[PDB]
Structure 1
């Protein structure tokens, strides 16, 4: 009757409020018999320590779903992975709270991971909407070589294929490269002025400084970036006029904990409404078979709509994310991020604020600047293209036809 829920959280206070949210969800729509419980564990510095902790504390406690969140330490190098892969052995669903990496979106690797925060790779959708609003047809992608940049590029290319169009160049740079001037020099020779960046904070700062050195932040250029490129060190060197994105509740662990607890409680009640439910296993050691109702529990989680949500309407897509998040469009004016619009679950709406494009101009710059210098290629065909050696001075002789007109040479 009692349904246990585990919570991998960051601080004792957050676990106390997780218990409070569990109690609140228990009070409302309890299905007349089920009384949910709540067990919580603080994140551990080492991944192996956490794997053993979740095996011993959560898994042995008959947890139906596990709530995981980033530790208070600023490092965010895939902390919830051991949770998703200890609870993924038995198809026990895992609830991510502040994990925005796109690697978890692939279900072939993460079998039973669902997050409340959509990952960074969905930001590309916003850019396409902007490409639909400001009529930008030629863009340049500046993506990392890791999984996140590749996923963002793939999503943007999939979106663009519907329009029968493609980015002129998709420059991939390895993470942590100190010198990126070669790629930006290559991009400068192109025509498109819509530069789209998808990189971590350090890589975003490096790209920003390299663009500043190359005078790429001036007038006629427009930059579209994500949340990682306008936060932290990347904000220090961000060029003025950049169009960043921010999540309304991305760092609000409170609202995420509350809505995740509500959704998981509703899903547990919906599952217990059905038939042939098996009980969760005890302990990692001694049990090897998967949880039979794991797949259907994840499916019922993915089909539950949380009507009244603190973060908004909570939904789930086939990739396992929220699919509906509010992205706030932040423009960097006078070295200060000011909101110039907000992107809802499906559309972008501007506000009374005026967008200051890079270089300080108010008018919307054109997508590209046409090149009046053309690289002409020819071959040595005798009747059509005679080719002759030039003199020492560098220009060959003037010649005249039978009429006497000069023969034009290049």
Structure 2
């Protein structure tokens, strides 16, 4: 069998080949050998697709690994090219949450959870802190909609939904209007999910409106506390980070191990057809992806280099570990560990925006109410006022101060 990989650097190709050799040695009892094929990413999406079609599909690669470098970059061309023949594709550095769609990206798996799953973590922070009043400031893109849907479903599971889900158009810096509208919402917990530039603009708007003072709690994801946004982040922001989301060597090793484990089980049956080798005139499904992607999803690795390996019904990383950090004195410090089911804080003290050293209630009740009444003679007498600013004072039959 041949395993293809698209890596940013040559050294990563060496690590992938070493991992493939290790998998071969571990599974050397069987008479199945795995071969490693590596290609380098290219700036042009069309060039990348042509390269994957030429040097990758022609080798009858059962599965293809992709790692998008931070500096097209997204694995969409590879996924689209492989989906024609229904060849599973495993991504490592990809969390856009677009690839989680079964209809769009066919036969795709990810070793890291998408940004949407971050919402679940927030739910935990809303269970151990008594925060039942929150407001969402998601964007209008697919990622924001997915995060909002996940949060709404989680809240519905608790029979307690949010109050305002006001959004904003990406690329529109002006968010002052929305911030002012949300200011008089009798809520203090604010959940944000946007790009780095959007996060920076939102932080600027909040600071200009004195919305980052005492009594306000801000929750963000991972992209709002990195890059230029981190430079504009007000003090007292609870951010989340992935324990193993940037070290691609461990992910490559885990993916190689999982694919090697799954291949042996796949070949232990009949009616097995090799993948296309010419990809020049053939236009038919490989007939091998089905019953193979399911096997990969159902293959639970005993123990990897980054933890237990599992996949959900949508084919995504399951039971991940997060680090909850608080920005204090322009220095991010870890304050808690999310072990996949619960959140455990450390001995460090969380510094809130107001520096109160105690978790604010996060919700204030307005003491002023607006009442609407109708004109009913027995119950509501309405009369014109005087020219001074108040209607004439009247007394009852008993000489009591009738109140108007």
Same fold flag (TM > 0.5) = yes
User: Aligned to 2:337, what secondary structure does the other structure show?
Assistant: strand
Alpha-carbon offset, residue 320 of structure 1: 1.0
8 Å contact kept, 2:275–2:288: no
Of 218, 221, 226 in structure 2, the residue corresponding to residue 223 of structure 1 is 218
* Contact 2:45/2:77 (<8 A) preserved: yes
CA 1:42–1:398 in structure 2 vs 1: closer, same or farther (change >3 Å)?
A: farther
**Root mean square deviation of aligned Cα:** 1.6
Larger CA deviation: 376-385 vs 294-303: 376-385
In structure 2, do the counterparts of structure 1 residues 314 and 181 end up closer, same or farther at CA, with 3 Å as the change threshold? same
How many Å apart are 1:224 and its aligned residue? Answer: 1.3
Which deviations, in whole Å up to 9, do the C-alpha atoms of 1:365-400 show, x marking residues without a partner?
A: 113111111222233344333444545554444344
Deviation per residue, 1:6-36 (Å, 9 max, x gap): 1111112212211111111111113521110
3-state DSSP of counterpart to 2:126: helix
1:404–1:119 CA distance, 2 compared to 1 (3 A): same
Q: Give TM-score scaled by structure 2 length.
A: 0.96
Cα shift readout 1:30-52 (whole Å, capped 9, x = no counterpart): 35211101111111112111111
Deviations 1:143-166 (A, max 9, x none): 111110111111111111111000
Task: Give the drift of 1:172.
Answer: 1.2
Q: Is the 8 A contact 1:140 1:192 kept in 2?
A: yes
Moved more, 276-285 or 346-355: 276-285
Partner deviation per Cα, 1:115-165 (whole Å, 9 max, x = no partner)? 101011000000001111111111111111111011111111111111100
Given the two structures, how large is their TM-score scaled by the length of structure 1? 0.94
Q: Judging changes above 3 Å, is the alpha-carbon distance between structure 1 residues 108 and 380 closer, same or farther for their aligned structure 2 residues? A: farther
Asked if the contact 2:87/2:288 (under 8 Å) is kept, the reply is no
Residues of 2 paired with 1:258 and 1:391: CA distance? 86
Any gaps of 5 or more consecutive residues in structure 1?
A: none
Helix, strand or coil: the match of 1:306? Answer: coil
Q: Retained in 2: the 8 A contact 1:129–1:347?
A: yes
- For residues 56-75 of structure 1, what are the alpha-carbon distances to aligned partners after superposition, in whole Å with 9 as ceiling and x for unaligned? 111111011111111251xx
CA distance in 2, matches of 1:334, 1:269: 53
Structure 1 contact 341–351 (Cα < 8 Å) conserved: yes
Q: 1 CA distance for matches of 2:286 and 2:225? A: 42
How far does the alpha carbon of each residue in 1:261-287 deviate from its partner, in whole angstroms, 9 at most, with x for none? Answer: 111111111111222211011243212
Cα distance change, pair 378–48 in 1 and its aligned pair in 2 (3 A): farther
- Please point out which of 5, 9, 12 is paired with 2:10: 12
Question: What secondary structure is seen at the aligned counterpart in 1 of 2:50?
Answer: helix
**How many positions carry a matched residue from both structures?**
404
Q: Check whether the contact 1:11–1:72 (CA below 8 A) recurs between aligned residues.
A: no
Question: Could you list the runs of 5+ residues in structure 2 that have no partner in the other structure?
Answer: none
Secondary structure, counterpart of 1:349 in structure 2: strand
| Structure-1 separation of matches of 2:171 and 2:146 | 18
Tell me the distance in 2 between the aligned counterparts of 1:332 and 1:298. Answer: 41
Q: Structure 1 residues 10 and 164, CA, compared in 2 at 3 Å: closer, same or farther?
A: same
The question of whether the paired residues in 2 share the 8 Å contact of 1:55 and 1:283 is answered with no
Deviant stretches of 4+, over 6 Å: none
